[PDB]
Each structure stands twice: as structure tokens, then as C-alpha cells.
Amino acid sequence: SLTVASYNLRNANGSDSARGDGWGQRYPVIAQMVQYHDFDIFGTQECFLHQLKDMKEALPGYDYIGVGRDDGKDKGEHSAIFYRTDKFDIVEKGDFWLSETPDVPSKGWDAVLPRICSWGHFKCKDTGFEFLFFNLHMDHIGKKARVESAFLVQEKMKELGRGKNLPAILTGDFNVDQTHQSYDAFVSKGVLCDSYEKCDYRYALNGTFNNFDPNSFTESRIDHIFVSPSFHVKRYGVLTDTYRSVREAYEARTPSDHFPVKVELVF
Numbered sequence: 001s002l003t004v005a006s007y008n009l010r011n012a013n014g015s016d017s018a019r020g021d022g023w024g025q026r027y028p029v030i031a032q033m034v035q036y037h038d039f040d041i042f043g044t045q046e047c048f049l050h051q052l053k054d055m056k057e058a059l060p061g062y063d064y065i066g067v068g069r070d071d072g073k074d075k076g077e078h079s080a081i082f083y084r085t086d087k088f089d090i091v092e093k094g095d096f097w098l099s100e101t102p103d104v105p106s107k108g109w110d111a112v113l114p115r116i117c118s119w120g121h122f123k124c125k126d127t128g129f130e131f132l133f134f135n136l137h138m139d140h141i142g143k144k145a146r147v148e149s150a151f152l153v154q155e156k157m158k159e160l161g162r163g164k165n166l167p168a169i170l171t172g173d174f175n176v177d178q179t180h181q182s183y184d185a186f187v188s189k190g191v192l193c194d195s196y197e198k199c200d201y202r203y204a205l206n207g208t209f210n211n212f213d214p215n216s217f218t219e220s221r222i223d224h225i226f227v228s229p230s231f232h233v234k235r236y237g238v239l240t241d242t243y244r245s246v247r248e249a250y251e252a253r254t255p256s257d258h259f260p261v262k263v264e265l266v267f
């Protein structure tokens with residue numbers, strides 16, 4: 001019934017631009033995808049502020065929440081959440097760091113960089129249905145930080161209902177795949193389920209990371225959408241959409257180095 005997504009948009013850098021995967025070329029395609037596949041609300045990873053402004057401008061009808069992970073204002077990568085303003089209101093929103101001091105910009109446990117989870121308390125403008133939407137990007141080095149981040153996020157899921165026990169959706173780039181201990185940490189308490197396992201219908205012609213290679217295949221999934229067990233998950237899809245650029249013959253290009261994960265859930 002409603003469509004949610006998780007999409008790592010890939011931080012802008014000159015090195016991509018050089019290889020022909022520049023942000024300026026990708027982002028217009030990303031935005032088209034968001035509009036065509038009708039994402040109602042989606043978590044993004046890796047955007048600098050200027051990337052968020054580009055996307056906001058390409059997406060009339062959408063707004064976003066979430067602060068920079070470096071200083072909690074505008075600096076650094078965001079775990080930004082985009083949403084259609086005609087479908088959802090924000091009741092409350094916030095951000096916490098994946099660390100022992102979640103309230104402030106900080107690194108956690110054995111991680112090498114600061115990591116942020118951003119969240120919204122949303123209300124469906126049509127049906128009044130209310131829910132929590134979380135979105136994060138995990139550390140690549142800190143294995144303990146990833147396991148602890150999972151328990152931390154689940155604690156936050158109990159604290160943030162504003163008085164209710166709200167159902168939760170959690171998107172993100174979890175860095176390691178479904179065979180890891182941090183994945184099991186998310187699903188082991190009965191508090192969240194993997195959309196991939198729970199969906200009525202599953203369309204998955206690939207895993208989620210592609211490395212800007214249009215010919216890659218993996219069974220690994222490092223981008224997940226986890227939902228409270230009370231959600232009906234009607235459909236799960238990996239979108240393998242590609243655009244083309246003139247070679248130096250055209251060649252296939254991925255809009256990001258991940259594929260988006262699209263989930264349809266009943267509200």
C-alpha cells in the first residue's frame with residue numbers, strides 16, 4: 001500500500017567524476033527513479049549537504065530531515081530521510097550518534113568514523129497512521145560498534161513513541177551482509193523483521209551493492225529495510241535500473257554504487 005525505500009546515493013567526489021560516475025550526471029537519474037517508482041519515504045546514505053540540496057531541487061513535493069554526522073549541523077555525510085510532504089506530516093524528529101554518548105557528535109566503541117542515525121515520527125495524512133522511521137549508516141571497521149549500534153537503535157525505538165508504542169521502519173547501509181553478527185542482532189529480539197524474509201512477493205535479481213559495475217552479481221545484501229512485526233510486507237524489490245553514457249559504443253552506468261531497495265508495506 002505505501003512505498004518505502006533505502007538508497008545509498010554515494011558521496012560526491014572527484015574520483016567518481018573522473019571514472020564517469022560523477023554526482024552531477026547520476027543525481028538527475030536517481031531523482032527520476034524516486035519519482036517513477038513512487039517512493040513515499042526513503043532513507044538515504046552518504047549525501048553531503050550540497051547533494052541533499054540538489055536532490056531536494058530535483059524532487060518537487062519532497063522534503064527531508066536529518067543533520068550532518070560531523071558537527072550535527074551541516075558538516076559531513078547525512079543519514080537523511082526524504083518524504084512526500086502531501087502524504088506525511090512530521091510530528092517530531094531527531095538524530096543520534098552510534099556511540100556511548102548518542103546525544104552528541106562522537107565515535108562509538110571501535111569505529112573509525114562518527115555515525116549518525118536520523119529519525120522521524122511520521123503521521124500518514126490520509127489515514128492518520130503513525131510510525132517511526134529510522135535511517136543509519138554503520139561503521140566499516142568497528143565490528144563491536146555495529147553490534148552495539150543494533151541494540152542502541154532498538155533502545156531508541158522504545159524511547160521515541162511520544163507516549164505510544166509506535167511501529168518502526170529502519171533503513172540503511174549496514175556495511176556487512178546478512179551472514180554477520182550485527183544483522184542477527186537486529187532480528188533476534190522479535191522487535192524487527194527483514195523485509196527480504198517477510199515479503200509476500202520477492203523481486204531480487206541481485207544483492208544490494210554493485211561497485212558501479214553494471215555486470216556485478218552478489219547474494220550479499222548490505223542495505224536492509226527492517227520493520228516491526230506488526231507491518232504486512234506486501235513486496236520487496238531490488239531496482240536494477242541503469243542509464244547510459246557515451247564511451248571512449250555507449251556503456252551501462254548505475255545511478256549509484258548500490259541498488260535501491262524498495263518495499264511496499266500496509267499502513
Ligand SMILES: [Mg+2]
Pocket residue numbers: 008010011046
Ligand atoms: Mg559507499
